[PDB]
């Protein structure tokens, strides 16, 4: 989970480089970005559990 | 020049100063310099930013 103000830091780094961004595009991008990281990390943990 | 000296007072030594005289940022000076670098990026992107 990103703190209500952790959404504001994601907005600042994007705002500085020239990317229009709003808290809803940070929450949808994050929900998909962490669904993928979590599952792929779980599968790498599968690769390590195998041994 | 007064503004520059005040900046050096809050942000602390340069890295070249670290190799030159072994003279580095204090923790508060580290925070000040990181803020300064992010605020200089902000002015590079927008040279007309209000004061």
């Amino acid at each position: 989970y990103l703190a209500s103000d952790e959404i504001t830091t994601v907005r600042k780094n994007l705002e500085s480089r020239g990317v229009e961004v709003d808290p809803s595009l940070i929450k949808d991008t994050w929900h998909q970005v962490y669904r993928r990281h979590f599952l792929k990390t779980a599968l790498n943990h599968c690769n390590l559990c195998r041994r | 020049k007064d503004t520059e000296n005040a900046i050096e007072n809050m942000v602390g030594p340069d890295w070249k100063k670290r190799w030159l005289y072994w003279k580095n940022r204090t923790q508060e000076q580290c925070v000040h310099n990181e803020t300064k670098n992010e605020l200089e990026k902000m002015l590079k992107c927008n040279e007309e930013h209000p004061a």
Side-chain angles (χ1 to χ4, degrees):
Chain A
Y1 270 98
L2 309 177
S4 58
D5 309 331
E6 195 70 13
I7 303 293
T8 317
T9 153
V10 170
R11 297 267 300 287
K12 177 53 138 65
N13 205 323
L14 290 153
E15 283 158 11
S16 301
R17 87 194 66 172
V19 181
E20 68 84 17
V21 175
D22 68 307
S24 294
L25 184 136
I26 296 169
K27 287 151 198 172
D28 303 344
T29 302
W30 174 256
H31 183 21
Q32 291 191 22
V33 152
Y34 194 80
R35 267 174 282 181
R36 180 177 63 188
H37 170 77
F38 172 81
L39 293 171
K40 183 67 176 180
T41 299
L43 295 175
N44 288 339
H45 185 89
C46 292
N47 287 339
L48 294 174
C49 294
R50 290 281 187 178
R51 300 186 178 182
Chain B
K1 62 180 68 180
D2 288 345
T3 299
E4 289 171 350
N5 288 338
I7 293 168
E8 198 167 48
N9 289 340
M10 293 177 182
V11 302
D14 193 53
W15 290 273
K16 183 179 174 181
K17 283 201 173 182
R18 181 177 181 170
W19 301 111
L20 186 54
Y21 312 120
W22 323 120
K23 183 178 179 180
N24 64 34
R25 297 176 288 160
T26 65
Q27 183 66 41
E28 293 177 350
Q29 289 177 334
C30 290
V31 173
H32 281 284
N33 189 65
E34 292 293 308
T35 301
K36 179 261 286 173
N37 287 343
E38 300 319 279
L39 292 174
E40 187 68 20
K41 289 176 184 175
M42 191 196 285
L43 289 169
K44 288 180 180 181
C45 293
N46 185 349
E47 294 182 3
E48 293 177 350
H49 192 290

